[PDB]
Design a binder for this molecule. Structure first.
Ligand SMILES: [Mg+2]
Ligand SMILES: [Mg+2]
Ligand SMILES: [Mg+2]
Ligand SMILES: [Mg+2]
Ligand SMILES: [Mg+2]
Ligand SMILES: [Mg+2]
Ligand SMILES: [Mg+2]
Ligand SMILES: [Mg+2]
Ligand SMILES: [Zn+2]
Lengths: 48, 157, 41, 98, 138, 180, 154
RNA sequence: GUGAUGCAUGGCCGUUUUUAGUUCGUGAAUGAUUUGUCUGGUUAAUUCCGAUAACGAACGAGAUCUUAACCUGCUAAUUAGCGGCGAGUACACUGUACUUGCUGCUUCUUAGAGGAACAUUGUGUGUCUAACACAAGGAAGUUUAAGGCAACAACAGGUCUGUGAUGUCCUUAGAUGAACUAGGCUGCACGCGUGCUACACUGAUAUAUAUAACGAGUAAAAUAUGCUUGCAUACUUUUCCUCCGCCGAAAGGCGUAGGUAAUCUUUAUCAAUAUAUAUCGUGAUGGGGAUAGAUUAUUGCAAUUAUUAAUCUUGAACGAGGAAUGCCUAGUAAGCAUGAUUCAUCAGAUUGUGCUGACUACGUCCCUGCCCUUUGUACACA
C-alpha cells in the first residue's frame, strides 16, 4: 500500500466512486455529472 | 463547528442520499414522502447519520417488470391520471421495446406546458429505468397538476 | 539610417530635426536655455 | 436570534410570526435584519461527454440568513420560538447579555 | 443645516454631505484641489463654475466616495455635487433660485442631476466578454 | 462665461458651410471644458450629431488595440496639439480644427459607380483620416504624436497635399470623378 | 505649476490638504539635509520588488520610500509590513506568460520602519495592530506640510 | 472490468434552433394528403391585422422566473454606516484634519414587500387596421438590458472512459479484476487548431500617485514518559484564509492573532490599465524574453524528461504578417487586471467579476447559412 491521502486518486465521488471531475467546492465531493442530476434535491436552482 | 454554507450543502447531500435509499428500498410502494417494518429503516438512517409523478413512474416500472402489452398499460396509466384530476399528462417510453433498434413512444392526453417557470412549478416529472429482457426500458412520466393560477389566463367575470 | 550625434521656437522634435541630435541632448539643451512632453519660447 | 434558511418566503413568514409573538408583551424586539445572501454558485459544464459547444450552467443555492434581537429571559424566548415550525428554517437562539 | 444625497456612475457612489459653513468642499479627508489627475479636474469643478463660487460661501461640502475606478469616481462626485447643491436649495434656500440653478445645469448637460444607468453586462460562456465569442477554424 | 480647456472659448469660432454646422454641434449644450463626456451618443441614429467635435477627435485618436481604452492619454495629446497650434502657427486652435474638418470630407464616393456623401459621414471620415495620418506619422519615426497630429491639422486647415488625409481625400474624389 | 483659480478656500492644516509627490520630494530633501536616516548596506544594490527586474535609478530612493511610508501611516490607523508591501506593488511581466501583480520586497520596508521607530516617528501599538505614527512624528509631518503649502503660496 | 460494442439501450447533453415552428377538434376538398397554418401589411416572433373553405383550440412564441436599471426620502438596523458626544493631537477664525471611550437618523450599506412605461401625452407614416418613425416628459422608450426556461420531430451526433443506469459477447488466479514498483501520455523531419507574448516613443524603464467588483476561506502533526533511528503510552494545538512581529536581496521561514465568517484574512480598498515626475531616443534598441547555463526555496514518499517559485546571467525569432478566416452595435469591441474552478504544488485554460470606454451601422439580401411560397425532379440511404 502506497500513500493514498493527497492526490486525485486519494478521494473520489461520494456517489459512484469516480476519481475524475469531482466538484470539490464546499466539500460536496460529487463528480459533476452526478451533481447536475441531483442539483434539484441538494437545492441548487438555475436562475441566471 | 461547521460553517453555514458548508452545512447547507451537507444537508442537501444528506437529503439526496435519503431519497436514493428510499428509491432502492421501496420498489413495492407509492413513494414520495421524505419527512422524518419501518423500524429497520429507522435503524439504517441512524447508522448513516449519527396525482404524484414518481409513484406513477414506479407503478409503470412494476407493470413492465410483470410483463404487459406496454401500450395498454400506458393507456391505463393515462386513464388513472385523468381520473385523479390532471389537467394534462405525458408519458414517454424509449428503449429496446419489441424490436432491437431504437423506438421512443409518446403518450399524451391533456395539454402539457413545457417552457417557463410555470413548467417548473406546475408539472411533476419522474424518470425510472426498468431493467428487462435484453437491456433497459426508459420511463419518463410528466404530469401537469391542477393550478396557484396559470399566467396565460385572464379570467374576466 | 540616421546615426544622430551627442558631442558638438523651442521643442525637442524641432531641435532633433534641425541640428541632427539625440532627444536626450535636445532635452538637455532646453534645460540649459531655461536656466513629459515639452513646449518653449 | 439567527434564522438561517434556504427558502425566502417561508423565512419571511417565520420572521413575521416571531414579530407578532413579540408584539404580545415584554419584548424590546429590534426589527428583522436580513443579512448579505452569500450565494453558493456552482458552474458545472453540462453534458457528461466532451461533445456539443460546451454549455455551462450557473446553479445558485442562495442562502438567506436573517437576524433578530431581544432583551428577555430564556424560557420566554423559547416559548416565542415555538410557532411549531418545520424542517426547512434553521433557528438558533443566543441568550447572551453581550 | 445639512443635506445628504448621492451620485452614481457605474459602481462608484459619491455621497455628498452639504452643510452650512464657509465654502471648502472636500473628498473623504482631502481638498478638491487634489482629486487625482490634472486633466479630469474640470469635471468635478464644473457645476460649481456654473452656479458661481460666491453661492457656495454659505455651503460647506464633504464627499465620501467608495467603489469604482478613477473617471467613474469623478463622474459620481460631479453627480453628487449637482444633486446636492440643488437639494439644499430646494429645502433651506428659495425655490426660484433652485429652479434657475436647475435650468443652468440642464443647459450645460445631463449627468449632473439625472444618473448614468449603464452597468457591466454579464460575461457569457463560449467567449471572454459579453458578446465576444471565441473562434472557429472549421 | 462658457469655455473649453479654460483657454479657447469657441465664442470666437466661425463655420461658413451650413451643412457642416447641421452635422457637428458646437453649441449651447454641446459646450464642454474637457472632452471626456460619458454621453449616450450611439443609442440613437443621429445622436452622434449632438457630440462635441473635440470629443470625437479624442475618440478617433484612441484607436489601435494596444492603445485602446486610454481616453485620458488621447485627451492629453489633443490638448498638447491645441497648445502647439495656439503657439506656432498662431490661431484659435478650435477654428483651425473646424477648417480641417471642412476640408476633410470626400464629397463624392464610389460604389458597386459614383454617389454623394452625407455631411455627418464626411465629417466622421475627416476625423478618422486626420487621426490615422497622425498615427502613421508617429509610428516608428521619433517626432512624437501630438506634434505630428498638430502638423496634420495645420495642413488640413491650409488645404495642402503634403499631409496624408488630404491626399487620401483627393484620391477618393478622383476615383469618384472617374466613375461618373 | 500646480496653482490655479479655484472656487473655494483650502484649509491647509494637515497633509491630506497637500499635493503628494511634491510633499514627498520635500520630505526627502529635509531628510537629506538632516542626515537623520542612513542607507544601510544592501540598499545600494537591491531590487525593491520581484516585478522590477532592475535597480531604482533614483540615488536617494530610500528617503523617498520612507517619506511615502510616513504619508501612508498618517492616512491609515494601524498599518503592517504586509500592507506596505501590497501598497508598493507593481505588475511583474513574466516574459511570455501574462502579467501578475507583484508583492514588494518587504525587508527594506521593515528596515525603514525600524529606523523610524528608533528615531521616534512611528509607534508599535500594543492595542489594535501593526505600527502607526507616533504623535510627535505626526505633528512634525503636519508642520512640514504647512511649510510646503506656504512655499507653494509664495 | 477506465474490457468489446453508443449500430443493442437508459438517462443526460448536444445540434437542427433560439428560429418560429408543431399539432388537434369539427367542417370542407378514391387515396397519400391538403386546407386551417394565407395574396398582402406588420412583428423579435404561424406576433397581430386584413383577406378567406374554414371556424375554434392546444403546445411553441408572448406571458412567467432570475438578476441589473430608478423610487417609496413608507418596512428594518447587526456582524453596515451616519450622526450624537466625550476625550484629546495638530493648525485656522473670533471651524478643518486625525485617533481612543460611550451610545435620535437609514441618504449612502444590506434586502424583503411595494411602486414605476402602457408607445403615456405631442406630431408624422400606415388599408389612417395591426403597427412603426420622430419629439416632449421621464430613472428608463430597440418585450428597459441581460440571461434562464425550451414544443413537435429527429440525427443511426456524442457518452456503457460518470455511474452498482445496462444487454449480450469476452475475461475470471500465468485475471483485460484489484494492489505495488518504476516508465509513458509531455517522446518529434512536419501539417492544421485555441490561446499567450511581442514587434516599441499613445512606448519600455524606475520612482510617486490614484482608485474595483464578484469572491473564497478548518486519517496528519507537536510535546512528554517508558524501553529497544523504531515502537508503545499520555496529551494538545496545528491540517484552509492569512493579519501582525521578527529573520530573509528574493522566494520563503519561524513565531504567534483573528476567522467555521457583512465581525477576522479584507474590502472607506486585495488589482492592473490609469495619471504625475524622472532615464531612454528610434538604433533588433534599455523594444523583445525565446533558448540556455549555473543556485536558493516550497510543495510532496518522490521533482531527473528540469512541478512551480525566486536570484544572477544567456539577448533567438519578430520592423504590423501572404492565401484564407474569426468575433463584434453601448458600458458592448479592445485593452487591463482580478476572484473562483481544477489545487498537495502549478494558468498562459475555463468560468465569473469588475476597471479604463473606441470606431461604425441603425440597413441590405451581394456573398454565406437558415426559413417561406412557386417550380422541376428518375432523389427518399433523400
Ligand atoms: Mg407557452
Ligand atoms: Mg448515437
Ligand atoms: Mg398544413
Ligand atoms: Mg418565452
Ligand atoms: Mg493528453
Ligand atoms: Mg483546462
Ligand atoms: Mg462565416
Ligand atoms: Mg427510390
Ligand atoms: Zn459519480
Amino acid at each position: 500500500v502506497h500513500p493514498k491521502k493527497y492526490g486525485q486518486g486519494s478521494r473520489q465521488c461520494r456517489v459512484c466512486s469516480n476519481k475524475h471531475a469531482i466538484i470539490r467546492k464546499y466539500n460536496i465531493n460529487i463528480c459533476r455529472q452526478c451533481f447536475r442530476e441531483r442539483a434539484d434535491i441538494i437545492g441548487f436552482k438555475k436562475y441566471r | 463547528p461547521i460553517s453555514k454554507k458548508r452545512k447547507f450543502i451537507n444537508d442537501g447531500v444528506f437529503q439526496a442520499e435519503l431519497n436514493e435509499f428510499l428509491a432502492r428500498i421501496l420498489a413495492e410502494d407509492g413513494y414520495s414522502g421524505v419527512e422524518v417494518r419501518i423500524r429497520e429503516l429507522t435503524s439504517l438512517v441512524q447508522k448513516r447519520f449519527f396525482l404524484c409523478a414518481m409513484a406513477q413512474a414506479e407503478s409503470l416500472r412494476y407493470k413492465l417488470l410483470k410483463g404487459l402489452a406496454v401500450r395498454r398499460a400506458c393507456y391505463g396509466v393515462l386513464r388513472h391520471i385523468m381520473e385523479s384530476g390532471a389537467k394534462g399528462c405525458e408519458v414517454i417510453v424509449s428503449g429496446k421495446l419489441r424490436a432491437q433498434r431504437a423506438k421512443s413512444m409518446k403518450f399524451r392526453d391533456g395539454y402539457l406546458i413545457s417552457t417557463g417557470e410555470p413548467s417548473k412549478r406546475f408539472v411533476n416529472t419522474a424518470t425510472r429505468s426498468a431493467q428487462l429482457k435484453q437491456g433497459v426500458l426508459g420511463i419518463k412520466v410528466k404530469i401537469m397538476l391542477p393550478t396557484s393560477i396559470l399566467p396565460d389566463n385572464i379570467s374576466v367575470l | 539610417k540616421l546615426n544622430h550625434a551627442v558631442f558638438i521656437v523651442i521643442t525637442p522634435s524641432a531641435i532633433a530635426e534641425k541640428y541632427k541630435v539625440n532627444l536626450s541632448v535636445a532635452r538637455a539643451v532646453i534645460n540649459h536655455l531655461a536656466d513629459s512632453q515639452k513646449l518653449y519660447t | 436570534i439567527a434564522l438561517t434558511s434556504k427558502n425566502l418566503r417561508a423565512i419571511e413568514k417565520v420572521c413575521s410570526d416571531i414579530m407578532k409573538g413579540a408584539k404580545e408583551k415584554n419584548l424590546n424586539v429590534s426589527g428583522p435584519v436580513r443579512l448579505p445572501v452569500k450565494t453558493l454558485r456552482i458552474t458545472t459544464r453540462k453534458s457528461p461527454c466532451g461533445e456539443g459547444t460546451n454549455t455551462w450552467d450557473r446553479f445558485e443555492l442562495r442562502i438567506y440568513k436573517r437576524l433578530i434581537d431581544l432583551y428577555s429571559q430564556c424560557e420566554v424566548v423559547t416559548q416565542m420560538t415555538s410557532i411549531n415550525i418545520d424542517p426547512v428554517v434553521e433557528v438558533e437562539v443566543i441568550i447572551t447579555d453581550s | 443645516k445639512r443635506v445628504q444625497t448621492f451620485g452614481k456612475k457605474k459602481t462608484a457612489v459619491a455621497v455628498a454631505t452639504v452643510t452650512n459653513g464657509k465654502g471648502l468642499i472636500k473628498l473623504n479627508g482631502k481638498n478638491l484641489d487634489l482629486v487625482e489627475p490634472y486633466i479630469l479636474k474640470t469635471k468635478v469643478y464644473e457645476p460649481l463654475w456654473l452656479i458661481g463660487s460666491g453661492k457656495l460661501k454659505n455651503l460647506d461640502i464633504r464627499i465620501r466616495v467608495k467603489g469604482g475606478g478613477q473617471t467613474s469616481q469623478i463622474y459620481a462626485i460631479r453627480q453628487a455635487i449637482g444633486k446636492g447643491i440643488i437639494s439644499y436649495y430646494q429645502k433651506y434656500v428659495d425655490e426660484s433660485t433652485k429652479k434657475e440653478l436647475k435650468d443652468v445645469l440642464l443647459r450645460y448637460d445631463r449627468s449632473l442631476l439625472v444618473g448614468d444607468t449603464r452597468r457591466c453586462e454579464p460575461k457569457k460562456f463560449g467567449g471572454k466578454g459579453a458578446r465576444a465569442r471565441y473562434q472557429k477554424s472549421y | 462665461d462658457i469655455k473649453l480647456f479654460k483657454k479657447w472659448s469657441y465664442e470666437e469660432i466661425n463655420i461658413a458651410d451650413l451643412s457642416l454646422v447641421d452635422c457637428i454641434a458646437v453649441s449651447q449644450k454641446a459646450c464642454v471644458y474637457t472632452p471626456h463626456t460619458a454621453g449616450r451618443y450611439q443609442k440613437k441614429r443621429f445622436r452622434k450629431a449632438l457630440c462635441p467635435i473635440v470629443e470625437r477627435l479624442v475618440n478617433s485618436m484612441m484607436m489601435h488595440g494596444r492603445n485602446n481604452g486610454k481616453k485620458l492619454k488621447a485627451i492629453r495629446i489633443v490638448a498638447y496639439a491645441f497648445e502647439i497650434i495656439h503657439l506656432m502657427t498662431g490661431e484659435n486652435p478650435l477654428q483651425v480644427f473646424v477648417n480641417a474638418v471642412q476640408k476633410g470630407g470626400p464629397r463624392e464616393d464610389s460604389t458597386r459607380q459614383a454617389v454623394d456623401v452625407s455631411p455627418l459621414r464626411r465629417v466622421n471620415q475627416a476625423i478618422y483620416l486626420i487621426c490615422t495620418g497622425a498615427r502613421n506619422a508617429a509610428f516608428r519615426n521619433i517626432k512624437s504624436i501630438s506634434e505630428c497630429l498638430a502638423e496634420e491639422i495645420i495642413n488640413c486647415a491650409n488645404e495642402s497635399s503634403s499631409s496624408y488625409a488630404i491626399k487620401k481625400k483627393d484620391e477618393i474624389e478622383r476615383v469618384a470623378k472617374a466613375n461618373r | 505649476r500646480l496653482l490655479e483659480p479655484v472656487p473655494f478656500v483650502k484649509t491647509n492644516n494637515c497633509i491630506k490638504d497637500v499635493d503628494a509627490d511634491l510633499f514627498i520630494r520635500s520630505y526627502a530633501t529635509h531628510l537629506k539635509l538632516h542626515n537623520k536616516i542612513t542607507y544601510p548596506k544592501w540598499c545600494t544594490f537591491v531590487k525593491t520588488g520581484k516585478g522590477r527586474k532592475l535597480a531604482p535609478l533614483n540615488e536617494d530612493w530610500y528617503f523617498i520610500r520612507a517619506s511615502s511610508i510616513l504619508r501612508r501611516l498618517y492616512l491609515h490607523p494601524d498599518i503592517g509590513v504586509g500592507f506596505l508591501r501590497r501598497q508598493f506593488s507593481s505588475k511583474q511581466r513574466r516574459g511570455v506568460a501574462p502579467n501578475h501583480t507583484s508583492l514588494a520586497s518587504g525587508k527594506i520596508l521593515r528596515s525603514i520602519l525600524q529606523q523610524l521607530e528608533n528615531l521616534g516617528y512611528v509607534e508599535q501599538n500594543p492595542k489594535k495592530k501593526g505600527r502607526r505614527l507616533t504623535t510627535k512624528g505626526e505633528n512634525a509631518i503636519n508642520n512640514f506640510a504647512r511649510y510646503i503649502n506656504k512655499k507653494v503660496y509664495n
